[PDB]
Structure formats: C-alpha cells, structure tokens
Amino acid sequence: GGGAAA
Amino acid sequence: MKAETKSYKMDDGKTVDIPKDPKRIAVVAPTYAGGLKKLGANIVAVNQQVDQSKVLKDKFKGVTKIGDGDVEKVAKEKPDLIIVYSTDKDIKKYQKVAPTVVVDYNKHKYLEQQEMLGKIVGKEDKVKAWKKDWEETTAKDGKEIKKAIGQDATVSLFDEFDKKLYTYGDNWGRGGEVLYQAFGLKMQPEQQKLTAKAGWAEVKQEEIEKYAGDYIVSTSEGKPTPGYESTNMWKNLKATKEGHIVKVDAGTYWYNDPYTLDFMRKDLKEKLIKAAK
Ligand SMILES: [Cl-]
Ligand SMILES: [Fe+3]
DSSP states (O other): OTTSOO | OOOOEEEEEOTTSOEEEEESSOSSEEEOSGGGHHHHHHTTOOEEEEEGGGGGOTTTTGGGTTSEEEOTTOHHHHHHTOOSEEEEETTOTTHHHHHHHSOEEEEOGGGSOHHHHHHHHHHHHTOHHHHHHHHHHHHHHHHHHHHHHHHHHOTTOEEEEEEEETTEEEEEOSSSSTTHIIIIIISOOEEOHHHHHHHTTTSEEEOOGGGGGGGOOSEEEESBTTSOOOGGGSSHHHHTSHHHHHTOEEEOBHHHHTOOSHHHHHHHHHHHHHHHHHHTO
C-alpha cells in the first residue's frame, strides 16, 4: 500500500 | 490456435481480456500464490518470498522463483496470465508479456480475495465450498478460545517492520485475519483506532503500553529478542507480567491464503489456549 510494498 | 478469453474488470475499473482457463500463471505478487495453488491453478513462476513460509515453501518446489523486477525470467516461462500488485513498478513491462491482472491489495478482505481468485480462474464453486468449511470451523474455534481467555479480552498484534515497531488491523497479515475476523477476538482499542484507515501502522515504541492488550501476539518466534521486547516498558506490560505473550513465525504468518490460514488457525488456537492457563 503507499509507504510500504502493498 | 487462440485460447478463448473472457472479459475481466480489474480493481482500477479497467476491463482486460484474460484466458477463460489460464494454463500458465506467473504469480509475481506473492499474496495470491497459495490461493491460486489451492484452486489447482498451474503456476509456472512464483515470487521467491514464498520460501520464507513453513507452509508455502514445500508447495512451490520445482516452480521457478523470481524476485521483484525480473521481467526476463517471467517472460521465459511463457505465462498466459501474470498477477502483480497495484504498487508494482514494472506493470507496463509485464503487460507486453501476457495479460496482467493488477490487484489493489487493500481492495479485498481475505475471504473476498479468495473469491476474486476463484473468478479469475473460473472456480468460484470451489471457493464457496472451502469458505463455508473455513467459517464453520473457525466459528467453533473462536467460541472455544473466548471461553479460555474471556469474552472481553483484548489482543494486540506487534511486528518489527524495517527495524520499527508495527501493528496491524484485521487484514494486513501477521495473523490478523484469523485473530480478528475468523476467531472474532477483540482488537486492542487504540490499535484499532490507529490502524483503522490504512490497515497498518508504525507505533512509537515508547508508547507501546498505550496499544498493549490483555494478550499480545508478537511475530518474533525464532528470532533474537527485538528492540521492542527488550525494554523495561515491555517487561512491565500487564500481558508480559501475566504470561500472556504468544509468539508466531513472521515468514509464515505474513500470508492470508487458505493453506496459511489453516496453519495459523491451529497454531494460534493452541498458543492462545496455552497462554490463558
Ligand atoms: Cl486468498
Ligand atoms: Fe507489506
């Protein structure tokens, strides 16, 4: 998701 | 020659033509690997991350492993369908290789996710059957766990992510889907508030007591004691003082596919009942 992978 | 295709409306609203019956799936986004394997799909490439799972590694022996960005390796397996996350930076490149299904992770809760994979490969009936079994079983499990830990007991979930303390809502892996949905256990209220919009959150480690419930599940099993379990703050949490800590295997628990779910179901039920003694 934004700030990470998903 | 020309496999018959069906129209599929993706998460972004765009429609794409995919095979009615895909024969060679490249699973770049590893969230979707176990679910497609459960449905008997032929997977010709899979993200090497599955090898971190005690459950999924054995299930993908003999399957080409790929890391992020390896379009050439994916191309070489001549796939007829490619699965990636919406955050994948190589989506256009994948598109030139095979129809590419772009999944926005946060658009599907874990049961809907498996239903979505059923639609992709045309096996919705198999999903339905599996889902009914899953729900009935975890409903009885949850009722048993609640009698053991107490109906109002809260449960926190903590993880080390990129050297920081993280917590999760009910659908960002780390066992949350089984703890909070399948079992129906009560999430610690500040954890719920913090993770409500995003589904996940970094926690200021000096504020951990704020987010610590009656029981704590920590993904630290088989690891050296993380920074967040080593403080005097951790030592003085009521859950710690009471022996209410459950530790789980991070590499395995990251996932939420049917195989992983069955494993975490058993493992957590066992650990929770023991921690409640
Ligand atoms: Cl799934
Ligand atoms: Fe992630």
